[PDB]
Design a protein around this ligand. Sequence first.
Ligand SMILES: C=CCOc1cccc2c1-c1c(c3c(n1C(C)C)CCCC3=O)C2=O
Length: 327
Amino acid sequence: GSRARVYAEVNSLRSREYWDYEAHVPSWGNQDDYQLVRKLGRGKYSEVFEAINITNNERVVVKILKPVKKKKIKREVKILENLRGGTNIIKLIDTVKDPVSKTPALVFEYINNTDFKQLYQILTDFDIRFYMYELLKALDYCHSKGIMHRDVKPHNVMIDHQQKKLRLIDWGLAEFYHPAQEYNVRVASRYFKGPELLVDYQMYDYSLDMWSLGCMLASMIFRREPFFHGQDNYDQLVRIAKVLGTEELYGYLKKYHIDLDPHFNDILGQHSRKRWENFIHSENRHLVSPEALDLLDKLLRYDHQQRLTAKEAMEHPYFYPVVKEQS
Ligand SMILES: C=CCOc1cccc2c1-c1c(c3c(n1C(C)C)CCCC3=O)C2=O
């Protein structure tokens, strides 16, 4: 089997009520205090609005939850409660219901997001270090709280590039980590799915989020977004293997006794592991240092166990300029 190298037992060591979200009873406040201003987006199970609290004029974001198992709602609510105060985790202001329909909604702090497509073409070297460090604070926090996000991607990382504020949003796929538990591999967005998901390995952990973070780092330093652009879940693994290597994939599978869907036989081909320097060219050279490549190499690894933890990544020399500035 497999276990997280960090925070493996932290839910076991807490009160059952911490992680037994099905038993959680939220306190549902009154949505009538909020005026919806504009639609910001629509997810598979929610729609999101900018809003104003009419009682105090606070600008907020209201996530109206579409009908789903109330179990999934309790999970997201309990996770957000447990993460209260966490650095760079979106702040849950309240849990409310339409007082007539009883439809639930989550009220979050507002962030003035700069859409990532334009932003990621204009970041400086220091900006990338800064924002990756801020995102790592959120991941180390949630991992330390026994929670895997399972959907790290640019669309879930709100960045106010004027105030230099970052928040990790959309905890609707997040789950509690318990050692030896088998999890659904149908999580994360295609381009950010770790190889463990793509090969149907269910005994994954916090390190899934570190793969996704590595994908984001690669896209920022190299200016190829998304970095691994699969056409489907099968092709996603092929795109990874064309960089990390096919023999290297097979060694990973063998180590964890992972069975490979035979449809991969016709599409993986044979590929040597590539040097990360191969992705450097005149348009991105100013963003790519030895430190950046060393960090990236330690995140984008097949073996989920040997990827850096969020804390190990934060301690890497790549972030020394950020730490010194935050003196
Ligand atoms: C214009 C962008 C700002 O958007 C914000 C800002 C603050 C807080 C949140 C969002 C947000 C949330 C959620 C979603 N957005 C957006 C991306 C549409 C979509 C998926 C579900 C979700 O939770 C926030 O919590």
